[PDB]
């Protein structure tokens, strides 16, 4: 039997499938950039989305249906995702250090000034300010959703989390429209390189946060979350606030200062 | 006059190992003196010394590329 | 340059290679002291037959064992900083050489006045004159005057190189889009052999550096003849 | 602290009207500028390796209205 | 707007329900909190429950000590810590 | 349930000495002989 | 029955077993590459021809020995086998990510082996500095495949680090403090902390290098306003924490081995050990530009970096004097793992003092990119980390396999290994002092004799690992099990039997605070 | 209808949870491992053909 | 760590056979590929 309150996982195959799917992505990028084949890359993308869906559905099955989630288990899950958040913080900090080393001392080939000549930077007080307002408003709406969960209100939570997802989708399509109507490209020097890598990785992270929010929404509408044991939604709030903090550093760093 | 220029002196403003900004700023100062003496109409060649300074510091390839992009009009330095 | 069965450094010509060689002797004496301490203590303290495997006072020697390595570390560090600050003082140089490391050959510009430039490739092994040095001889040796401060600006056109000559105590990265300072002096005439230290492709072993240091009148004659 | 109705009114006072007048401010500032003259800089429009989508000269978000090319504009 | 969301006193099942139901009356059969009833004498030893014939028992027998010392504890009368001799007894009937 | 005891917690059978000797030498010899064949390939190409 | 036990495994012992097997294979790949390197340098001339194939061999030797032999075996294998055993946990906290980390490792190995197989080859060193690793000097798919190998290995180690930190902090018994855990648990905690604080920096660096290669960004080439010193900053900001990842679980292993075979119930100065490991971990993040003393930094910057290198030098001195102090007056049992630990102590001391010689920036200007650096890092890596690996393997092979090795063959293996690697890497100090630089396939004649000596030393070390295989086979050629183990009351991993069952700590440990 | 599925996922079967639903998760698992095996062997074939020059 | 007597004890001849097998299995492919480098260089 078992007397420890730790969950013993059944032998599960999604480690092997996810690992070889990451092998498929790496080989697909190599085959796309050089030998120009797209089928292996799409096969890998399908393999990750299938493996991730089955892994997280298994976690849902063992959590909210079998009840293997003792308080030590979600304490460990809190520790693990906090560690993952810190890892992503230092990833974006490496990108910020690249931008700061780029813009602190401009070189002779750029002309010795930031911004370089022949580029038109985005004025910060238009629609990037709207993106900051949208992300902050989504943070406030998800805090309303968290307090509606703790207090025990369902329809207030549904309205709050629905408008949180709506502003997340509005933010990412507004950012995509600004990738459309911008006056400089990724081949426009170190300014374009730093700008588009930083904003693109933030865009990938906010669409990951939006997907995690929408699966949290369908889980809530399927009555999975109880009054206090609702760790997936707290995970959504934590990652969403992390994306908000990263965008605040982006808007102060790149968009406003030096432009 | 500071001629009989035998080699470049020790510049106290940029005293470290990296000497890129010395030749970039000295070539920029030479062209800005060319502009200033063109607008003033006076003696250009009194800052001919500046020219010899960049001739000692950054190589023939860098200087030749910079003459090419000032001849075409693709110079990011605001002269 | 290196001779067979050589253990220590090459002998010094510049002043700084003398002070760094004396500092190397100092820190290697310190290394020998600490290594002999550790070796003699472990060989002492394994070979006993007495035993004591009970509770011992945990903190009664730690303050000594933290102050003594700090004393030896600052004893290393103060001459290190003293000679560290003696490479980038006021030089007031004499000549200025510009060295660009292209894809597996060096190039040298003397353009203080009467612009002069040439290329240094290696004399190949089958094309060596008799008595020459394998993997070190060049086409055009780099001629510099005796015992004078010579400003030297090092860079490369494409990739990372490293202009290094050991016996003068020079080793400086050659970075594209950069321009690096090195002052070079001497005390004896003659030929000094270095070679590239940064990885730079499939012929990285195959760029040597020969510095030929001569008196100033002969440097003037060589400058007049070479142009 | 730890209220529930005060955060709904906090959203409905500050967040959604804030995004509302910010969207109106972006609507009143929704005016494009003229296309600047093309000067062929060499630290811009970097072509080392061709792109791996479609032709190879266009970027992923290359709209021909505002974005240039190394060989001028597009007409 | 009323209730709506479930409360974990009736929705939550399985091991979480078992430890919550056991812990609302002050019982910890699944070992989340450090145990109690401590006295080192042989008349009133340290009682440990189990479900098997033996259990690993770890002793901090003097405070501010680094290393726990571990030993097996079997059935029968009380064994004791090998360096301090605090008495440990096993009562294997819990679940 | 999986086997418990000495020699059974390993992903290969240790129950035959010579078969395990052959398996060990082909495993570690393949590990040793991979980069030499890689170098052979790079020499055969150019 | 097989694919459920091993391919779909969800318990830590099996993952540690496959970590040990994969690392043994990858180590044999690495020593084959080292035999190749010392084969070309044995005599003057070009055994293989150009320097490109030699640089491919050098880079492959570095990457295979770093990311595929020490890190998987040491961190993954010993952590998965021992960390739930010393703290008394039934399993890892997230066993599925542990399995996924292990199974992500051989894709990274296959990508590296493919990187060596494309027509260019990633002959740039394990420093993947641009513009040599750009799409101009290395136009091909080799550098991209190496970058993706490092990406997969980084994701593997990040997942393992997250799992290790949550299983150490959370899965203790509720009465134990963190300061009552064994020292190897502390080393695994601190190593996992520095791993997940360091790996995203190289992840971003090689992401930017990949986008420079294939997306026409100009992060690093100066023709578009980039700067390769930025790459060197990011790479070494990862790279010295990576160095201390290599060395720290070895410190835990040698502390455990010396405490066991010395007869002591505790290491002397446990708080000093813990504080010194925390100090080494915290100060590993501020000393990176000692790898950049000739690039053209400020004089004040290098003064700070050599000073900070001395302050990182002091607490490992506290650790080695505490190892000597716990050697004091014990029942010294001359086991093979004892000989490996004492060899670790002496030769890692020698490697540390050569690092102290390299610490001064002026003698670093003399000795950058020479074989003095190579002798330093092999005296720490190839001798300290390898000796700690072999000490842990010899000590815990009765726990893993259930059988005991022949001690006489083990002591012969230590003697052969000691002589071979000592005669391998001692002439490299003289080769570095004389001035023959790194990454060369051919040298002048004056560096011949030491090179000759160095080459033949490698073959002796080769024979060592050959008879090491015999050692393992001899255990399974004998099938002698264990009576029991001494000092099993203090060491928790030895008290469930040799080998422990599949289900351990179903009834957990019983420790009280009040 | 969470508690009826809570009753359903109490095992009494000796089957893992990723094969516990019955038919559809079993077949999509079946296809998942089949397509990732095909992708892995096509990766090996692609890497061998990429290693060979023309 | 004290030990059992060996259940299947190994004679010295079989240890010699095993070490000869390990040496020949390691030095046949590497020894063969280093027996001729010049043939791979388009002789
Ligand atoms: C039916 C036939 C009989 C039963 C199966 C046994 C033989 C086949 C097998 O699946 O055999 C089992 C496999 C096990 O391997 C695996 O399960 C996966 C290994 C992954 C290696 C990846 C290498 C790189 C690949 C990519 C390039 O064994 C191997 O292939 C070779 C192992 C040889 C012995 C290694 C000894 C290592 C000693 C040092 C560590 C001790 C640890 C103690 C604890
Ligand atoms: C196991 C891995 C490992 C470890 C532990 C270390 C440890 C150290 N390393 Fe090293 N290092 C490498 C792996 C490692 N290194 C690698 C792989 C490279 C190559 C990178 C490249 O290719 O460029 C490298 C490069 C490297 C350089 C680059 C030189 C150059 O090329 O320019 C330098 C110089 O500062 C350095 C320094 C140090 C120092 C100062 C320590 C110290 O942490 C050592 C610890 C010190 C001791 C153990 C001293 C013992 C102390 C006592 C006994 C107390 C008494 C002492 C006194 C009284 C003073 N290392
Ligand atoms: C883990 C790191 C590691 C290890 C062990 C080694 C080990 C060795 N190294 Fe390596 N080496 C590096 C890391 C390592 N090296 C790095 C990082 C570089 C820099 C590359 C560059 O310049 O970019 C380098 C560079 C390097 C060069 C430089 C080539 C050049 O630049 O011109 C040379 C040549 O002399 C060399 C030689 C050797 C030799 C002869 C060994 C021998 O010690 C080989 C013996 C090793 C073993 C036998 C492995 C031990 C394993 C076992 C014994 C079995 C384990 C299995 C179980 C316990 C089950 N090394
Ligand atoms: C001449 C005679 C001998 C003089 C001996 C004493 C000299 C001491 C100099 C120490 C360095 C001082 C300095 O300016 O450092 C610059 C450095 C500058 O570092 P940094 O933060 O600019 O580093 C980034 C470097 N770049 C810009 C290239 C990316 O200052 C510091 O790091 C902090 C202040 C000085 C700390 C000095 C003590 C170091 C040991 C304790 C560390 C904690
Ligand atoms: C990028 C990779 C990392 C993305 C972020 C991962 C975040 C992981 C959070 C923790 C997961 C976990 O195990 O949570 C435990 C929880 C079980 O507890 P819980 O459901 O809260 O209990 C309810 C009881 N009534 O279980 C859950 O909450 C499981 C349900 C939530 C998991 C959904 C994951 C969605 C991810 C969306 C982005 C995916 C990106 C990659 C794939 C697409 C690529 C285009
Ligand atoms: C273990 C000891 C610590 C490691 C020392 C590594 C450095 C080294 O060996 O340096 C060589 C050292 C100095 O060389 P040097 O004697 O000056 O040579 C010229 C005149 N014979 O040479 C010596 O000290 C003598 C030869 C080596 C002795 C060991
Ligand atoms: C996977 C690895 C890849 C290669 C495949 C290898 C397949 C097996 C071939 C190698 C093993 C083998 O058959 O070895 C020959 C050996 C002959 O027996 P022999 O050693 O003479 O007997 C002991 C007395 N000295 O045969 C033996 O030793 C095997 C017989 C030993 C007794 C077996 C009893 C089985 C009972 C059921
Ligand atoms: C890239 C790889 C991402 C892998 C991933 O997201 O794994 C999520 C992991 C799965 O759940 P896990 O906790 O391992 O289940 C065992 C016991 N519940 O979930 C967790 O372990 C909890 C959240 C960790 C997020 C890590 C993301 C990287
Ligand atoms: C030649 C290589 C194979 C040698 C085989 C051999 O001689 O084996 C005999 C012996 C086996 O070990 P033995 O001494 O019998 O007992 C263990 C001691 N505690 O072997 C040894 O003890 C190792 C000595 C081998 C000498 C050769
Ligand atoms: Cu230039 Cu090496
Ligand atoms: Cu370092
Ligand atoms: Na050679
Ligand atoms: Zn006690």
XYZ file of C-alpha atoms in Angstrom, chain G residues 90-512:
423
model
C 9.328 7.451 -2.009
C 10.033 8.969 -5.442
C 10.834 12.209 -7.211
C 8.277 15.004 -7.029
C 7.739 15.135 -10.818
C 8.932 11.753 -12.141
C 7.502 12.325 -15.617
C 9.733 15.340 -16.237
C 12.671 13.282 -14.936
C 11.901 10.628 -17.557
C 11.422 13.310 -20.222
C 14.767 14.928 -19.350
C 16.580 11.614 -19.731
C 14.819 10.817 -22.984
C 15.597 14.298 -24.299
C 19.320 13.623 -23.864
C 19.912 11.079 -26.745
C 18.112 13.300 -29.289
C 20.684 15.941 -28.318
C 23.457 13.372 -28.753
C 22.120 12.356 -32.174
C 21.919 16.010 -33.201
C 25.542 16.537 -32.134
C 26.649 13.410 -34.025
C 24.776 14.720 -37.061
C 26.444 18.121 -36.557
C 29.804 16.431 -36.909
C 28.560 14.687 -40.086
C 27.372 17.587 -42.294
C 29.951 18.647 -44.906
C 31.338 21.615 -42.960
C 31.530 20.278 -39.409
C 31.314 22.494 -36.321
C 35.033 23.053 -35.925
C 34.894 26.185 -33.772
C 35.643 24.993 -30.236
C 32.997 24.613 -27.574
C 33.063 28.361 -27.458
C 30.912 28.943 -30.515
C 32.188 32.494 -31.015
C 30.994 34.440 -34.045
C 31.952 35.393 -36.773
C 33.743 32.054 -37.092
C 30.468 30.297 -36.266
C 28.547 32.514 -38.689
C 27.088 31.609 -42.054
C 30.208 32.896 -43.843
C 33.085 30.857 -42.401
C 30.769 27.954 -41.500
C 28.105 28.108 -44.218
C 26.201 24.905 -43.556
C 23.973 23.055 -41.113
C 26.613 21.932 -38.609
C 26.585 24.946 -36.284
C 22.772 24.990 -36.261
C 22.657 21.307 -35.284
C 25.182 21.946 -32.495
C 23.058 24.895 -31.310
C 19.960 22.697 -31.196
C 21.932 20.008 -29.324
C 22.773 22.594 -26.667
C 19.122 23.738 -26.657
C 17.846 20.211 -25.979
C 20.487 19.570 -23.302
C 19.602 22.884 -21.661
C 15.895 22.035 -21.573
C 16.809 18.623 -20.103
C 18.926 20.135 -17.345
C 16.353 22.867 -16.600
C 13.632 20.225 -16.150
C 15.935 18.138 -13.967
C 16.869 21.198 -11.902
C 13.219 22.121 -11.289
C 12.432 18.531 -10.276
C 15.457 18.325 -7.955
C 14.775 21.620 -6.161
C 11.109 20.825 -5.557
C 11.884 17.274 -4.412
C 14.596 18.454 -2.011
C 12.692 21.378 -0.505
C 9.256 19.776 -0.357
C 9.651 16.002 0.101
C 11.567 16.056 3.381
C 10.004 14.563 6.486
C 8.055 17.365 8.179
C 10.339 17.431 11.243
C 13.683 17.628 9.434
C 15.156 21.013 8.648
C 17.136 21.755 5.505
C 20.278 21.830 7.684
C 19.835 18.190 8.747
C 20.153 16.803 5.203
C 23.311 15.085 3.895
C 25.919 17.111 2.042
C 25.287 15.560 -1.376
C 21.648 16.673 -1.106
C 22.974 20.192 -0.494
C 25.278 19.958 -3.514
C 22.384 18.774 -5.698
C 20.207 21.663 -4.418
C 22.845 24.316 -5.115
C 23.743 22.765 -8.490
C 20.092 22.769 -9.560
C 19.738 26.400 -8.414
C 22.710 27.547 -10.492
C 21.542 25.406 -13.429
C 18.156 27.064 -13.708
C 19.629 30.503 -12.993
C 22.332 30.033 -15.664
C 21.011 27.934 -18.580
C 18.520 30.496 -20.065
C 21.448 32.899 -20.610
C 23.141 30.495 -23.036
C 19.675 29.611 -24.386
C 19.159 33.260 -25.353
C 22.754 33.529 -26.597
C 22.556 30.592 -28.989
C 19.040 31.676 -30.003
C 20.505 35.039 -31.023
C 23.394 33.282 -32.784
C 20.929 31.076 -34.691
C 18.918 34.125 -35.747
C 22.166 35.787 -36.828
C 22.936 32.721 -38.927
C 19.535 32.192 -40.548
C 17.265 35.213 -39.955
C 19.652 38.015 -41.081
C 19.803 39.709 -37.703
C 22.980 41.569 -36.761
C 23.412 40.888 -33.057
C 27.050 39.881 -33.469
C 28.540 40.902 -36.767
C 29.837 44.501 -36.722
C 28.782 45.154 -40.334
C 25.234 45.684 -39.057
C 26.133 47.293 -35.731
C 26.639 44.110 -33.710
C 29.413 43.151 -31.340
C 30.872 39.656 -30.636
C 32.021 40.745 -27.149
C 28.292 40.694 -26.304
C 28.226 36.996 -27.241
C 31.312 36.368 -25.125
C 29.643 38.167 -22.190
C 26.469 36.063 -22.443
C 28.328 32.798 -23.056
C 30.655 33.165 -20.099
C 27.882 34.450 -17.831
C 26.486 30.998 -18.413
C 29.859 29.331 -18.658
C 31.426 29.799 -15.280
C 28.208 28.767 -13.438
C 28.393 25.737 -15.755
C 31.944 25.161 -14.452
C 30.717 25.096 -10.890
C 27.881 22.754 -11.959
C 30.643 20.406 -13.135
C 32.505 20.585 -9.859
C 29.885 20.812 -7.056
C 28.191 17.344 -6.879
C 31.727 15.996 -6.991
C 32.316 17.941 -3.764
C 29.245 16.284 -2.271
C 30.389 12.838 -3.436
C 33.901 13.218 -1.998
C 32.483 14.554 1.288
C 30.289 11.447 1.564
C 33.096 9.054 0.566
C 35.672 10.530 2.961
C 33.127 10.632 5.807
C 32.186 6.995 5.196
C 35.570 5.365 4.693
C 37.253 7.521 7.341
C 34.982 6.074 10.030
C 33.518 9.459 10.976
C 29.847 9.853 11.864
C 29.818 13.457 10.543
C 32.111 15.525 8.344
C 33.959 18.144 10.337
C 32.362 21.557 9.970
C 29.059 20.715 8.300
C 27.984 24.358 8.566
C 31.282 25.380 6.989
C 30.672 22.921 4.138
C 27.154 24.274 3.571
C 28.281 27.918 3.769
C 31.218 27.305 1.425
C 28.984 25.577 -1.121
C 26.501 28.473 -0.948
C 29.379 30.940 -1.324
C 30.844 29.095 -4.327
C 27.400 29.037 -5.927
C 26.716 32.717 -5.266
C 30.159 33.887 -6.393
C 30.139 31.812 -9.564
C 27.945 34.494 -11.193
C 30.295 37.478 -10.809
C 33.602 36.137 -12.161
C 32.843 35.396 -15.822
C 35.135 37.960 -17.457
C 38.241 36.178 -16.216
C 37.691 34.278 -19.473
C 38.038 37.622 -21.317
C 41.241 39.238 -20.070
C 42.752 39.826 -23.535
C 39.627 40.987 -25.378
C 40.242 44.659 -24.580
C 38.230 45.408 -21.450
C 38.780 48.251 -19.019
C 41.723 47.988 -16.632
C 39.398 48.622 -13.662
C 37.018 45.898 -14.868
C 39.776 43.298 -14.970
C 41.043 44.500 -11.572
C 37.595 43.812 -10.131
C 37.385 40.445 -11.874
C 40.739 39.170 -10.599
C 39.816 40.363 -7.080
C 36.417 38.608 -7.225
C 38.279 35.525 -8.415
C 40.351 35.596 -5.193
C 37.182 35.862 -3.076
C 35.773 32.843 -4.957
C 39.100 31.121 -4.211
C 38.810 31.342 -0.388
C 35.709 29.193 0.463
C 36.814 26.169 -1.566
C 39.942 26.428 0.564
C 37.623 26.205 3.571
C 36.126 23.060 1.987
C 39.481 21.362 1.340
C 40.806 22.125 4.833
C 37.561 20.747 6.261
C 38.089 17.563 4.215
C 41.556 17.297 5.739
C 40.089 17.959 9.193
C 37.512 15.189 8.811
C 40.358 12.911 7.734
C 41.935 13.555 11.150
C 42.217 10.635 13.541
C 39.695 8.277 11.980
C 39.724 4.567 11.256
C 41.125 5.040 7.752
C 39.917 2.083 5.683
C 41.931 1.930 2.452
C 39.055 1.188 0.090
C 39.372 1.957 -3.652
C 36.973 4.906 -3.377
C 39.232 6.221 -0.618
C 42.128 6.268 -3.092
C 39.928 8.031 -5.650
C 38.948 10.643 -3.036
C 42.531 11.355 -1.934
C 43.578 11.628 -5.572
C 40.675 14.058 -5.996
C 41.913 16.171 -3.078
C 45.539 16.448 -4.215
C 45.009 16.843 -7.949
C 42.065 19.226 -7.574
C 44.269 21.290 -5.252
C 46.910 21.412 -8.015
C 44.286 22.408 -10.593
C 42.984 25.097 -8.265
C 46.407 26.650 -7.750
C 47.020 26.637 -11.508
C 43.706 28.468 -11.781
C 45.041 30.928 -9.195
C 48.102 31.445 -11.409
C 45.689 32.105 -14.288
C 43.628 34.427 -12.044
C 46.070 37.326 -12.337
C 45.165 39.218 -15.480
C 48.758 40.050 -16.445
C 49.904 36.436 -16.403
C 46.602 35.739 -18.132
C 47.736 38.121 -20.907
C 50.861 35.984 -21.163
C 49.030 32.660 -20.782
C 45.675 33.135 -22.554
C 44.765 30.400 -25.066
C 47.862 28.342 -24.213
C 48.138 24.821 -22.859
C 48.670 26.132 -19.326
C 44.917 26.772 -19.322
C 44.431 23.268 -20.746
C 46.500 21.758 -17.928
C 44.484 23.784 -15.384
C 41.107 22.720 -16.628
C 42.085 19.125 -17.139
C 43.532 18.948 -13.626
C 40.127 20.074 -12.354
C 37.731 18.429 -14.906
C 39.488 15.295 -16.156
C 41.026 14.518 -12.785
C 38.856 15.976 -10.011
C 35.454 15.442 -11.638
C 36.440 12.060 -13.096
C 37.952 10.918 -9.780
C 34.806 12.015 -7.924
C 32.716 10.134 -10.502
C 34.842 7.017 -10.032
C 34.759 7.344 -6.234
C 30.970 7.537 -6.302
C 30.705 4.660 -8.776
C 33.057 2.375 -6.822
C 31.370 3.277 -3.529
C 27.762 2.885 -4.696
C 28.133 0.008 -7.151
C 27.102 -2.417 -4.356
C 23.988 -0.275 -3.880
C 23.056 -0.062 -7.560
C 23.982 -3.499 -8.906
C 23.819 -5.531 -5.700
C 27.265 -7.032 -6.320
C 30.662 -6.005 -4.971
C 33.610 -5.208 -7.217
C 36.999 -6.870 -6.920
C 39.010 -4.438 -4.815
C 42.404 -5.531 -6.156
C 41.440 -4.818 -9.773
C 39.932 -1.527 -8.582
C 43.167 -0.430 -6.908
C 45.114 -1.476 -10.014
C 42.697 0.609 -12.100
C 43.279 3.623 -9.858
C 47.065 3.185 -10.093
C 47.037 2.900 -13.904
C 44.635 5.847 -14.220
C 46.737 7.978 -11.844
C 50.015 7.373 -13.699
C 48.393 7.816 -17.107
C 46.549 11.055 -16.535
C 49.400 12.567 -14.482
C 51.872 11.931 -17.283
C 49.236 13.133 -19.766
C 48.644 16.571 -18.280
C 51.841 17.552 -16.500
C 53.933 18.404 -19.643
C 51.077 20.673 -20.774
C 52.143 23.153 -18.074
C 55.542 23.411 -19.767
C 53.898 23.568 -23.196
C 51.769 26.462 -21.997
C 54.703 28.250 -20.387
C 56.855 27.854 -23.502
C 54.066 29.319 -25.595
C 52.418 26.798 -27.901
C 48.780 27.911 -28.166
C 45.500 26.046 -28.169
C 43.543 24.519 -31.059
C 46.649 23.631 -33.096
C 47.012 20.454 -35.140
C 50.702 21.090 -35.856
C 53.355 22.706 -33.675
C 56.969 23.830 -34.137
C 59.728 21.350 -33.370
C 60.604 22.876 -29.982
C 57.260 21.703 -28.576
C 57.815 18.166 -29.838
C 59.140 16.236 -26.836
C 56.508 17.195 -24.244
C 53.792 16.566 -26.829
C 55.277 13.116 -27.436
C 55.266 12.413 -23.699
C 51.730 13.745 -23.357
C 50.456 11.543 -26.176
C 51.677 8.300 -24.704
C 50.236 9.183 -21.315
C 46.792 9.225 -22.917
C 47.211 5.608 -23.972
C 47.896 4.573 -20.385
C 44.685 6.318 -19.356
C 42.994 4.517 -22.248
C 44.124 1.184 -20.815
C 42.667 2.288 -17.471
C 39.139 2.613 -18.796
C 39.627 -0.672 -20.679
C 40.229 -2.548 -17.460
C 37.443 -0.487 -15.873
C 35.077 -2.355 -18.197
C 36.669 -5.606 -16.994
C 35.893 -4.447 -13.432
C 32.194 -4.142 -14.208
C 32.158 -7.438 -16.074
C 34.038 -9.143 -13.258
C 31.284 -8.150 -10.838
C 28.756 -9.803 -13.090
C 31.254 -12.593 -13.673
C 31.255 -13.252 -9.929
C 27.696 -12.601 -8.656
C 28.822 -12.114 -5.065
C 26.142 -10.308 -3.059
C 26.432 -8.473 0.259
C 26.263 -9.688 3.864
C 25.389 -6.212 5.090
C 27.020 -2.802 5.199
C 28.808 -1.018 8.019
C 27.650 2.443 9.179
C 24.157 1.892 7.779
C 22.585 3.741 10.714
C 23.875 7.118 9.516
C 23.579 6.587 5.742
C 19.923 6.181 4.795
C 20.458 4.837 1.269
C 22.211 1.695 2.558
C 19.530 0.641 5.030
C 16.915 -0.737 2.601
C 19.240 -3.372 1.140
C 21.527 -3.762 -1.853
C 19.837 -3.259 -4.268
C 16.772 -1.540 -2.783
C 13.331 -2.691 -3.979
C 11.198 -0.946 -6.598
C 8.910 0.436 -3.880
C 10.892 2.104 -1.099
C 9.496 4.299 1.702
C 5.892 3.214 1.247
C 5.808 3.513 5.023
C 7.817 6.743 5.392
C 10.459 7.628 7.947
C 9.544 8.542 11.515
C 11.459 11.544 12.835
C 10.149 13.928 15.482
